[PDB]
Write a protein that binds this DNA or RNA. Structure first.
Ligand SMILES: [K+]
Ligand SMILES: [K+]
Ligand SMILES: [K+]
Ligand SMILES: [K+]
Ligand SMILES: [K+]
Ligand SMILES: [K+]
Ligand SMILES: [K+]
Ligand SMILES: [K+]
Ligand SMILES: [Mg+2]
Ligand SMILES: [Mg+2]
Ligand SMILES: [Mg+2]
Ligand SMILES: [Mg+2]
Ligand SMILES: [Mg+2]
Ligand SMILES: [Mg+2]
Ligand SMILES: [Mg+2]
Ligand SMILES: [Mg+2]
Ligand SMILES: [Mg+2]
Ligand SMILES: [Mg+2]
Ligand SMILES: [Mg+2]
Ligand SMILES: [Mg+2]
Ligand SMILES: [Mg+2]
Ligand SMILES: [Mg+2]
Ligand SMILES: [Mg+2]
Ligand SMILES: [Mg+2]
Ligand SMILES: [Mg+2]
Ligand SMILES: [Mg+2]
Ligand SMILES: [Mg+2]
Ligand SMILES: [Mg+2]
Ligand SMILES: [Mg+2]
Ligand SMILES: [Mg+2]
Ligand SMILES: [Mg+2]
Ligand SMILES: [Mg+2]
Ligand SMILES: [Mg+2]
Ligand SMILES: [Mg+2]
Ligand SMILES: [Zn+2]
Lengths: 155, 206, 224
RNA sequence: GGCGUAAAGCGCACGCAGGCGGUUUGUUAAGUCAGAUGUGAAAUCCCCGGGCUCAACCUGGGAACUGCAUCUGAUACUGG
RNA sequence: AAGGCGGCCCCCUGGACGAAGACUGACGCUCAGGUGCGAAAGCGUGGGGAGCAAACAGGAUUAGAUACCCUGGUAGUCCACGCCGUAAACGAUGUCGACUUGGAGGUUGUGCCCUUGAGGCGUGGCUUCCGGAGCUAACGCGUUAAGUCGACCGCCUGGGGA
RNA sequence: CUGCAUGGCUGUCGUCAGCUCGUGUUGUGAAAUGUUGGGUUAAGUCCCGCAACGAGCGCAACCCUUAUCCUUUGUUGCCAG
RNA sequence: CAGAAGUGUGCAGC
């Protein structure tokens, strides 16, 4: 069911009386395809332990996005901290035109056709935040109609 | 800093001696020397037979040797044809007539010596040390040790600067004299030099 | 329940205007002597609805957890909870009592095994110092956990006496997605609560009225 | 795209030229919008097809030439 | 307006705010260039000179001590009339207008209520401290915004060189 | 020859009272909390409180010796009667 | 009350 991606591994460190303790952090994402995704950030003193924590965090903390038969409903702008993300739907056979950190998220979401651009900070954590924020804001014709009370013939 | 050797501090409290004989100062040193020679021989001989331990007892101006091994049939030999050779060569080394007994170590995964030798062999097979350590700890715990820790030291992975790396699971109270801490050490002679492996296994108090 | 019962209980008395929360503004009738008065004719229908959904989940044989921590209220909370065979926390709420349930269950099983060895195990076999310290352990475990010792899992709903005092329990329940029913006073923030019951959270007779109606509805639904 | 602390608010104020303008009615039709006509050289660049043994090259037709200009309409907004 | 303004009295004089109306009828906002004001130190001419005090002298301290400390002490500090035009000239936050949960205080008007008071309830101006949504890299800001918007102006584009 | 390529062993801060981990929670994050707070101890020793709940290595105890007694045996040791 | 200075240059722990 779930597809899983490892986006990044980073060695952080704490200074202490005796010297330096090195610790590993891992950023991963999981998703069903079909517009369900989550991300998980794990910490450990060992790389595989960090990855397992990340996956376990990413199986909860999981959100639904109303995909438009494998593309976006409309262009969206997402932002988090210093990272700004623009995404736009694309014709069939466009593929995923995105950077690695966004490509992972969009792949596990199952958005086959997208144009995307990162602006400002490309820091993977905040980029993933901004992308999830954007996908979470995206909305679809049926619930737009429900809000405005029109029939979907309004499309 | 340094720690006391955990077996020696427990001798007579909970751990028995591996040699048991009485001698006057005259023959004491010769007994100790011939015991050393027989131990060295048997260790060199049975290196693949998973010999855990050798106990030497000198009754009635005789020597008898008990060998604890996790692979008895290899040491005994078919129809016992091998213990004949061992006992004859031991009688040659010790001079006194020799008897050999063999005992099964049922669960070598709970034996610090056999675990240390296993890790050492795997390291010489160029296995990743992380995997060897993790496998050892996990097997010991699943077979019911009250705790374990393992340590490996020096030029790990061919690194240019030596490290020590250690991993611990469960409880391991080295200061508790009641604790039957089994302990052992082994050395892997890689192309980069000596890697030192230490193993502690805790099986409960008293 | 009727508005005269709530007036008898004094549930309409809010807090001083200094300490009001503007989010409660819709539930305030006004002020007297610069003290806020809770609107009872809003409270009553909301409380009836809360009891209706409580009854619904009770008929599903759901497990209710009552939560209060306050000097006098704790005992009425325990009494009512046991009166409906439901579970309770009446001393300090442990941080993580639900979101970290996978840990706290160890202390519960510890309490069970300690009681069993205390009563059936011939606890007198111990030394006097050991018996003393293990009995004090038993005492502290009783105080903290006895009301949930048999819950065997997460509750199906929380009933809370004071959303401002017990905000930890509310936030944990929200995190787990469990419905929270709570009495909410003019200083509280309601946004964590699914079934707000606006009313005084301090008058022991008000607490008695609320717990009584709750436990009656629970017994009703259980009898199905 | 920025200007509390990373580079960045004139020390403060008055005030000419300049930019901007509450609300209602009428009128104009400058900005704005619509339609028509002329012009926007060929080549090059796109699409559909021909010819070199293929290709690079050559070539037919189309589209485009994101514009400019002159008439004839609309008057919501902006300007008079 | 900012720089700033502190014993008491008189003369001349600017602005702000509140209540109630009456009046004119878009007359408004911002502002390149320009013009005015602008702490302290400093400069010119003429006065005054208690205290304080750059420079300078002596005594100490110190390895040295062109300082810190001590004893003295000149310009200056004060006054009149000119010049200079800079400051961490700071809220390190341009001016103007609208909108958006609250709490505790200060100061100054004014309305109503038995005014009974050292009283209750309303309504304006300015100002101090917390804190919500929201915003922010974070610190924090938070109806006196660093929130949501509009008009105009000034300014920035890696560190040194500068 | 290389202790600055290593194992083993050892000194030292120091027999100082500290050092960490799991799960939960807070923060974009490095991290934080727990381990901090009021008392107390030789001591992160113990008790109350507290978004923390538990655990591990340390402290303590188990070990040897010394200060009192009692049972048993009584030579090569002892000598009350 | 007095108490100044500390040559250059590196390498593991993913
Ligand atoms: K005046
Ligand atoms: K100017
Ligand atoms: K002087
Ligand atoms: K000196
Ligand atoms: K003078
Ligand atoms: K440069
Ligand atoms: K060494
Ligand atoms: K943690
Ligand atoms: Mg950049
Ligand atoms: Mg920039
Ligand atoms: Mg600076
Ligand atoms: Mg700056
Ligand atoms: Mg300014
Ligand atoms: Mg002006
Ligand atoms: Mg002008
Ligand atoms: Mg003008
Ligand atoms: Mg207009
Ligand atoms: Mg026109
Ligand atoms: Mg001056
Ligand atoms: Mg002068
Ligand atoms: Mg003069
Ligand atoms: Mg002087
Ligand atoms: Mg300047
Ligand atoms: Mg400035
Ligand atoms: Mg604030
Ligand atoms: Mg603003
Ligand atoms: Mg430059
Ligand atoms: Mg040397
Ligand atoms: Mg510590
Ligand atoms: Mg303390
Ligand atoms: Mg301890
Ligand atoms: Mg604590
Ligand atoms: Mg020097
Ligand atoms: Mg230096
Ligand atoms: Zn209350």
């Amino acid at each position: 069911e779930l597809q899983e991606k490892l986006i990044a591994v980073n060695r952080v460190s704490k200074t202490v009386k005796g010297g330096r303790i090195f610790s590993f952090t891992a950023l991963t994402v999981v998703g069903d395809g079909n517009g369900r995704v989550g991300f998980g950030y794990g910490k450990a003193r060992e790389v595989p332990a960090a990855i397992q924590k990340a996956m376990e965090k990413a199986r909860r903390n999981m959100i639904n996005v109303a995909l438009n038969n494998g593309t976006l409903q409309h262009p969206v702008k997402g932002v988090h901290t210093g990272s700004r993300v623009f995404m736009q739907p694309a014709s069939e056979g466009t593929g995923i035109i995105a950077g690695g950190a966004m490509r992972a998220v969009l792949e596990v979401a199952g958005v086959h056709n997208v144009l995307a651009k990162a602006y400002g900070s490309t820091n993977p954590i905040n980029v993933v935040r901004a992308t999830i924020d954007g996908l979470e804001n995206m909305n679809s014709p049926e619930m737009v109609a429900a809000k405005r009370g029109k029939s979907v013939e309004e499309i | 800093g340094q720690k006391v050797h955990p077996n020696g501090i427990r001798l007579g409290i909970v751990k028995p001696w591996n040699s048991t004989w009485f001698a006057n100062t005259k023959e004491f040193a010769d007994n100790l020397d011939s015991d050393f020679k027989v131990r060295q021989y048997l260790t060199k001989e049975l290196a693949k037979a998973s010999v855990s331990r050798i106990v030497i007892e000198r009754p009635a101006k005789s020597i008898r040797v008990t060998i604890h091994t996790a692979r008895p049939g290899i040491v005994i030999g078919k129809k016992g044809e091998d213990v004949e050779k061992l006992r004859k060569v031991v009688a040659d080394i010790a001079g006194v007539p020799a008897q050999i007994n063999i005992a099964e170590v049922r669960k070598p995964e709970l034996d610090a010596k056999l675990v240390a030798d296993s890790i050492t062999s795997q390291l010489e097979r160029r296995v990743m040390f992380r995997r060897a350590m993790k496998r050892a700890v996990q097997n010991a715990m699943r077979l019911g040790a009250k705790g374990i820790k393992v340590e490996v030291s020096g030029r790990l992975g061919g690194a240019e600067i030596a490290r020590t790396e250690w991993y611990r699971e469960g409880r391991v109270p080295l200061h508790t004299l009641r604790a039957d801490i089994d302990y052992n050490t082994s050395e892997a002679h890689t192309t980069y030099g000596v890697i030192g492996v230490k193993v502690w296994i805790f099986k409960g108090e008293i | 329940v009727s508005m005269r019962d709530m007036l008898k209980a004094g549930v309409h008395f809010g807090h001083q205007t200094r300490y009001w929360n503007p989010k409660m503004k819709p539930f305030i009738f006004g002020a007297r002597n610069k003290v806020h008065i809770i609107n009872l004719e809003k409270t009553v229908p909301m409380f009836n609805e809360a009891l209706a959904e409580l009854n619904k989940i009770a008929s599903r044989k759901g497990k209710i957890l009552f939560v209060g921590t306050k000097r006098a209220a704790s005992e009425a909370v325990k009494d009512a909870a046991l009166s409906c065979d439901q579970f309770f926390v009446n001393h300090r709420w442990l941080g993580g009592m639900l979101t970290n349930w996978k840990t706290v269950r160890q202390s519960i099983k510890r309490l069970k095994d300690l009681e069993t060895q205390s009563q059936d195990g011939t606890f007198d076999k111990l030394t006097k110092k050991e018996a003393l310290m293990r009995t004090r352990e038993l005492e502290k475990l009783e105080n903290s956990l006895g009301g949930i010792k048999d819950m065997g899992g997460l509750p199906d709903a929380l009933f809370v006496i004071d959303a401002d005092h017990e905000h930890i329990a509310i936030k944990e329940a929200n995190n787990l997605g469990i419905p929270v029913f709570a009495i909410v006073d003019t200083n509280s923030d309601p946004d964590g609560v699914d079934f707000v019951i606006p009313g005084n959270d301090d008058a022991i007779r008000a607490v008695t009225l609320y717990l009584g109606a709750v436990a009656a509805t629970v017994r009703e639904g259980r009898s199905q």
